[PDB]
Structures are given as C-alpha cells and as structure tokens.
Amino acid sequence: RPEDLGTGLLEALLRGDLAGAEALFRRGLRFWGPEGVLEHLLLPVLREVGEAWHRGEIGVAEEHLASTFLRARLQELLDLAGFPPGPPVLVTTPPGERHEIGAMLAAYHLRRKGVPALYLGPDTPLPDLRALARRLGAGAVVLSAVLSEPLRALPDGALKDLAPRVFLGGQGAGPEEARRLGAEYMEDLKGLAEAL
Amino acid sequence: PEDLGTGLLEALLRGDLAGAEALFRRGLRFWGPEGVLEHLLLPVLREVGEAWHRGEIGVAEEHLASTFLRARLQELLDLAGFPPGPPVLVTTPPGERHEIGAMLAAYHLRRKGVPALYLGPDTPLPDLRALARRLGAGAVVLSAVLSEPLRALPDGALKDLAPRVFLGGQGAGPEEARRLGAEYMEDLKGLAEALW
Amino acid sequence: VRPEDLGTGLLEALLRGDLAGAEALFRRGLRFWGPEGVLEHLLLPVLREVGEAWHRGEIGVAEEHLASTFLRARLQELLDLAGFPPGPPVLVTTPPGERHEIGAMLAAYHLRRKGVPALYLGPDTPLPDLRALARRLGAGAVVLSAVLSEPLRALPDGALKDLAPRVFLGGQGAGPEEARRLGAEYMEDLKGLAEALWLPR
Amino acid sequence: RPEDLGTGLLEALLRGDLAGAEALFRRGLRFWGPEGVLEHLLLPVLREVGEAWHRGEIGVAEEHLASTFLRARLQELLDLAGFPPGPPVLVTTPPGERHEIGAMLAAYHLRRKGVPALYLGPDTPLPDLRALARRLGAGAVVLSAVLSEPLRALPDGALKDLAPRVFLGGQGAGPEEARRLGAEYMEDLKGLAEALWLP
C-alpha cells in the first residue's frame, strides 16, 4: 500500500533487488504521478538512506547504489518531459559538489513547465560555465548545492555574472551565502519556473 | 529489438496485457519517447488495421490492441511537460472517431514546449471555435485519418476556428485543407516549428 | 470535507485549460480518499455534472469532451495500476452502438482490484466478434456496460446468452427485464462482480 | 547517413540540441543495434569529445554536457540488458576516479551474458565497497580505471578480498599495477563474464 512503498523500495535497494525496486518505483509513479513520486518516494528514500548512513547502519557503497538507481529513474522522467527549443537554462552544481539529484530535480521541474533546462551533470568550473552560457545565449544558470562546503570554497561574487539570471538553491545554500556569491536564492523548485 | 513489434502484436492477440506492457516499456527504453511511437506503436497499430482490412482478425481483437496502444500514448502524453500560456486545442473533425493521430500531434507539441490541450475526438466546429475564443487559444490542430468527414464539411468550415488552424493525417491533403481554409502539414516535426 | 467538495474546483480547472491544476487536485483527492473513494465521490459526480450541464445547454461539446477525456485518462491510469493477473480473462466492453466507456472501465477496474483478469477491449464490440474472442481466449465471462437503452433494444431476444459461460450486463441503460430478454445476468453492484464469478478467495 | 552519425551527434551536443542528439542516437540504434551503437557511435563520440577537450577546442562545460548525454544513453542500455537473480557482481571505479563510462560498459557486457552486475556509480571508498560486497554476498567486484594516478594512490593489496574474484581494467590499469593491488587484470570486456565463471 502507498504509505509502505518507501519502506519497500529502500529494503529492495538494500538487498540489491533492482528489479523489485524498479517495479515499486513504477507503482509509485502510477499512483502519485511524476511530481508526486519525487516528493513521496524518491526524496523520502534518499533521506532515509542518508539518515541510515549518518547513523552508521550502511556505508557509502549502499548510498551510491541507491543514488545511482534514483538518478536513473529521474533521467527517465527528464527525457519523458521533452526538451523545448529556445535559449536554454544551464543546470549544474558548484565545483566540488558531486551530488546530482537536486540539480536534476530543478531541471525536471523546469522542463515540465516548458523551460529548456540543459542538465550538464555536476561539478562545472565557473569560467567554463560562463563561457557556455554566453555561447548558447542562455537566459539563466541554476546551481544546486546539497553541501555547504563547496559554496564556502568559492570567492565573494563568484556566481555574479554567469548568465543574466543566476539561481542557487539546495539545503547547502541559504540567502546570505547566495548574496555573498552574487546569485539569487530560491527555496522552492516549483517557483523557479515562475521566476524566469 | 527489431522483434519488439512482432512480440507486442502477438502478446496483444493472445490477451497477454502484462507481457504487452513490458514489451512496450522495453521499446520506450530502447527507442526513446518519440522513437517508440515511430518504431513500435504505429507499426503495430497499422499491422492490426491491415490484418482487419484483410479479414484475418475480428473487431474484438482489433479493439483490444487499439485500446492498449491508445492507453500507452495517453501515458506518454501526461508524462510530457505542460507549459503555461495560450493553449493549442487538438482534436479531430466531426464524424472522426480515431484518436491516435490527434494524441500524437498533442504529444509532439507538448515535447516542444507548446501547451497542447487534447480534447478527445469528434468536436463540432462551433463548439470548438467557442472554446478556442474563451481560452484565447493561439491555434487549433485537427487530425483526420478518414477523408469522408472532411468531405462532408462546407468550403471554409475550418477557416476561423482560431488565429491558426492546422489539418493533417492521411485523410487530409493540401487541396482539401485549402478548400476548408486550414493550413496543411505532413510532418509533425514541422508543426512545432510553425508555431513556437 | 468530502470528495465531492473538490468537484467544482476540478471542473473549473479543466474548463480554463489548467490541466496541471486539475491533475494536481485529482491526485490530492487520490492521496486523501484512496482510489475507490475518489472514483465514487469525485470522478462520477463530476462526470454527471458535466453531462447534466451539457444536457442543460450551459457548456458546449468541446468543454464536455475536454472533461470527459480527462476523467477517462485518470480512470485508465487507475485501471493499469490495478495490474493484470494471469488466468482465463473476463472480457469487458459495451454493446454495439454504445460509445461511452466509463462504465465498462469501472467494471474492469473493480474486477482487477479483486484479482480478476479483466480485459477491457474498449467500447462498441460486435457480438459475434466478441463471442469468437471469448472462445479463443477461454474467457470465463463477458461484462457489458450500457449507458443508453436503445443499443440493447436493437438486439434480438437471447443475443447475449452465449457470449461466454457467464454474461453480465449493467449500466443505467440496462434493467432486469431487458437483461432477461437478452439472456444476460443483471448486476448493479460493481464491487460484487468478482464475487458473483464464484472463484476462490 | 551512418558514416555521418558521429559527426552529427557531436555537433548537435555542442550546440545544446538535445532533441536532435537523441534522434541521431536513435538512428544509430536502428542501424547498428544495441551492442553496435556502443562500438560505432557512443565510444567514438566520447573519445572525440575527450580529444577535442585535450586539444583545447571545447571547455569543461561542453564536455560535461556531452558526457552526461552519453551516460544517459548507456544507463538505458544497461537497464535493457536486464538484471538476473543470484549473487551480484559489484561494478564501480577506484576512489578518486569520477569517470563512469568504463564501469557502465563492464556492467553492460556482464548483464548481456546473464551476470547480475550491480553498477554502484563511481568513486567508492574501499572499506565501504568491501562492506557492501559482504552484505550482498557478492561473488565478484569489477573496477574500471581510466586514470592511473588513483590506482597509484592505493596501498599494496588494497583490492584483494573485496570478493573472491576482483577484476581491474581500463586504460588506467595494467597487469603490474593489478598484481600489486591484488586484482586480476583483463583487457577485453567480451571475455570478462567467461573469466569470472571459470577459474
């Protein structure tokens, strides 16, 4: 039953039953819809994995396994959203940030609203990012920070003119760090599309 | 993979919906969203139609397969993004009961960032015109598999359904479109370009 | 708060072409009340309101189409979430001339929820073709949904009698007298259809 | 058209035409099939991207974009190969190795041969990897190294007893470094499943 899908998915992953995990995920998709399954299945399982690690019950390998699975499910949804033409929004994470899920969520929410979000993958050097934005005439750059340490490593103003609009979010980011870096801060992914 | 079409058709004809669903999903993984329509859904649909037209299968078997494929397309349709802004209304001419062409058109538009509202088939023109006007629709798109429903319409019938009116499907040709006051397009890939 | 309270919001979302909003509201209803709840207390009441509003001339065919297509899509989703078990199927359709799908889809859904392999063919299946498919697949039953009475009236006495070992007819277009004339078993309760099949558990 | 697919795909990616890149990739699939498209399209384009970067013709962002696309196509094929039951083989890259494609190829070739290859993602610390292998009762661990420096940083015997069988490959690896690390070395992915089954 739905309230038990999260537990089932997590237990499936922890015993290496990818087939079973995939079926459970698909059930979640059918029940909650695309946005629903992200809010009520993907994120809760990801958090529980994190909490289990933070508590010492599993290691990085189990975490990697679950993240890779969920990244694959999200990439599927990303390609089902389609990719509109027109000036792209480049989506990535700060240098040193290897966690991808936040960035992919942001790209997904934009693409569902008809915004051409180009997900680059994580960990993009800022000069290279600036150059690509300029060449493709990107309207915005969007950064997801799960950890605060990668943002702390950046100098003041580092994000300031990557693109006409620069957005920073994720639990690793706050309004003060965004201001220091010269980015706009946003808490809700659902409002990122509206903001553009 | 070049065997997915045969497998799907045989699965449907023996009423193995579970197997047909898996095969369809394989086709999705392999060919992508637009690809599975070109390489799996439409070929199977046509083979079913041809088999019926040849007298090899009965209406019930055909219905079963068509209903399945309609359901798979509706799934993909709702997985696509839906932007805000003036909608494009998508339907079929009065008397045209076949849905898949219209659904394809709506899907290809939604993938390209166009807010295509699929109404279902068989919409009377005054009612269609009124809805377009009320919602401030930028366009109406009609899919005609049969030519007879178009033939029954008076000259100019489609001319003012919305600021732009497109007619396609194998039931339509450039001369019939001109007679009816619609713009003709053969390729769905060019419909999105024509709007943006 | 009850499911039918969301009906006005859902319908108004649909009528202004806010598909995202309509979908979200429907999904909320699903989370809160569950599938059977939302079907009985949101989907059907809204479908009827749409129909009545059309029958009264308050909305045009296009708006009605839009709403019906939306509700059909939500029901098809639930239908495919119920899964498809193995075993001899039950074929679900509507009589020739009957284009309305929702009743048939409901019947298929309630069977599938109870572990019965209900094959929904779509609507409007000729009887000899239906009989042939039932025979080939070794179907235990056929289920017919009739919203209109005229399609049933057009059929000869006994026409439904031997489509399969069991044949069930329902929908507001059907009554017990017409079912008896046609040789079908008449059935009002969707939740009791599986039980009526006399299968294990 | 086939002889033009690689150039077309690369140019599509470099101008951020994901729709066009996806179609071109699908054409490659129609021509060459699943295994074919990897040898004739995915890998050549990946290498050309790399070479173009190494030559200074594109920046990291363009490379990231193309690699992310190709990673997505490979993950698709990986999950199409299916996942059999039975004791898994864990597939990853050494600590410090962020490149994924080699590992994904290895997992794919195993899965095609009916081996349950669990791709973990890249860059797994060895104690954590050891623990997961133990928990899942994995018969083998497979590591793909494109860079040599991450292997050089590892202590002697570091890969020994991650499972009863441990394989190391990729251009970053050679037989001498594998022996030092306590892994078995191999070059050809088409032989890897057979090499795991047999002694």
Ligand code: B12
């Ligand atoms: C999972 C998790 C991890 C995972 C991260 C990988 C993964 N699986 O995603 C792993 C295992 C790596 C991890 C470990 C650590 N992480 Co941790 N862990 C978590 C946990 C449980 C969830 C984080 C999470 O929600 N991630 C999913 C992302 C997508 O959600 P999100 O970042 O909150 O972002 C949301 C929004 O901001 C928005 N969003 C995301 N991106 C963007 C971008 C834009 C533009 C916008 C508008 C919105 C947006 O969408 C998201 C969902 O709504 C939290 C605890 C908790 N929150 O309950 C911590 C937590 C974040 N971790 C913490 C940290 C920093 C760590 C550690 C360094 C601490 C340690 N014990 O060593 C380690 C080391 C990191 C490393 N070396 O890899 C601490 C933070 C404390 C602090 N700030 O000092 C937390 C808060 C735990 C705690 N309560 O103490 N962690």
Ligand code: B12
């Ligand atoms: C499948 C099929 C059926 C199926 C329908 C399945 C279903 N949809 O539920 C069934 C078996 C029901 C059927 C029956 C009939 N159909 Co029939 N059958 C076909 C068949 C084999 C394929 C049709 C098809 O490709 N559909 C899929 C659609 C999407 O393809 P499409 O219309 O070509 O559209 C493409 C493009 O135009 C574009 N597109 C679509 N819409 C739009 C819109 C725009 C704006 C744009 C830009 C692009 C675009 O995308 C599509 C794919 O690339 C063809 C024969 C053939 N080989 O083509 C006939 C055909 C269409 N059928 C035909 C006939 C005669 C019938 C019947 C009337 C036969 C009869 N006497 O009873 C019945 C009608 C039933 C009714 N309800 O009225 C004729 C039509 C002749 C005509 N009118 O000119 C055809 C051509 C067969 C023939 N050669 O005689 N048929």
Ligand code: B12
């Ligand atoms: C909605 C509706 C429509 C909608 C249909 C929406 C849709 N896409 O499905 C629209 C607007 C299209 C419509 C139009 C028409 N319909 Co109308 N409308 C209705 C309405 C309001 C409700 C029908 C309904 O409840 N549908 C849902 C189904 C599932 O409900 P149900 O059949 O009662 O079934 C219940 C149970 O029997 C059970 N069930 C269903 N099937 C089965 C099977 C089994 C085995 C079991 C156990 C149980 C079961 O499930 C349901 C639970 O409540 C009624 C009037 C009313 N207030 O009831 C008419 C009504 C059915 N319509 C009617 C008419 C006349 C029409 C039109 C012909 C009007 C016209 N002039 O063109 C058209 C028909 C077009 C055509 N195809 O020929 C008449 C039918 C008269 C008759 N048949 O004798 C009605 C009764 C209105 C009237 N009093 O005049 N209609």
Ligand code: B12
């Ligand atoms: C593509 C590439 C990149 C790409 C990576 C793209 C990507 N997303 O993977 C990019 C542009 C990022 C790149 C950059 C760098 N790379 Co580079 N580039 C290459 C290139 C052109 C090809 C590598 C390749 O083919 N990878 C794909 C994999 C699958 O191929 P493979 O490892 O040969 O594996 C084959 C087999 O071994 C088998 N296989 C793979 N794994 C396994 C496992 C097992 C068990 C088995 C049996 C078989 C097997 O499958 C493959 C055949 O189909 C080579 C140059 C060349 N001509 O080879 C370098 C090369 C690997 N790069 C190199 C360097 C130096 C770098 C950088 C460190 C440069 C720098 N920044 O200073 C960075 C890395 C930055 C970092 N630390 O993260 C060096 C490595 C030197 C060394 N290892 O001693 C090379 C050799 C170039 C050179 N001549 O200097 N590179």
Ligand SMILES: [Br-]
């Ligand atoms: Br009900």
